[PDB]
Design a protein around this ligand. Structure first.
Ligand SMILES: O=C(O)[C@@H]1CCC[C@H]1c1ccc2cnccc2c1
Length: 166
């Protein structure tokens, strides 16, 4: 978990302008978080990038999890193999507010991070899930009590977050 170049926002939250896939290949953390959907179909955004970096091994594995256990609930999670990215992948389902899902579930999504001591994660519900990314960071800071290293791909978004926080 040799994280470098992070800015400490709170006692347990760190932030960096970086591609989470590149961070996972360098650090090889214990846990890499995926911003997933209830059926674990990793077709775009963070999910698409993480799956692509495993050459579809994450998708094949996920399809087998769904076949055996059924879909996740919004706000829920499951732990799968991290393959070549991490020891484990914590797939987390944030609400899709652009499809009417309740924003209050963003807290439930972040509560999953608390089961792991150290995590490399993206912001939840901030892609096509349509939630405000600055609001998503506020819920993260208020909810997660374990050590989370957030990797933010977009430099424009990164600078807006760092400015709003500090
Ligand atoms: O950090 C960000 O800018 C956004 C915020 C929530 C989803 C993040 C995202 C989206 C697409 C990505 C594509 N490739 C690699 C990492 C990617 C990360």
């Amino acid at each position: 978990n040799s994280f470098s170049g992070y800015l400490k926002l709170t006692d347990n939250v760190y932030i960096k302008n970086a591609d989470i896939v590149e961070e996972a290949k360098k650090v090889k953390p214990t846990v890499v978080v995926n911003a997933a959907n209830v059926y674990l179909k990793h077709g775009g955004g963070v999910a698409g990038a993480l799956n692509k970096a495993t050459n579809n091994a994450m998708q094949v594995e996920s399809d087998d999890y769904i076949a055996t256990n059924g879909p996740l609930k919004v706000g829920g999670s499951c732990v799968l193999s991290g393959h070549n990215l991490a020891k484990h992948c914590l797939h987390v389902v944030g609400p899709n507010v652009n499809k009417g899902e309740d924003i209050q579930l963003l807290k439930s999504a972040y509560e999953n991070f608390n089961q792991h001591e150290v995590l490399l994660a993206p912001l939840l519900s901030a892609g096509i899930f349509g939630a405000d990314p600055i609001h998503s960071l506020r819920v993260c800071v208020d909810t997660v009590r374990t050590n989370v290293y957030l990797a933010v791909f977009d430099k424009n978004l990164y600078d807006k977050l760092v400015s709003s926080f500090l």
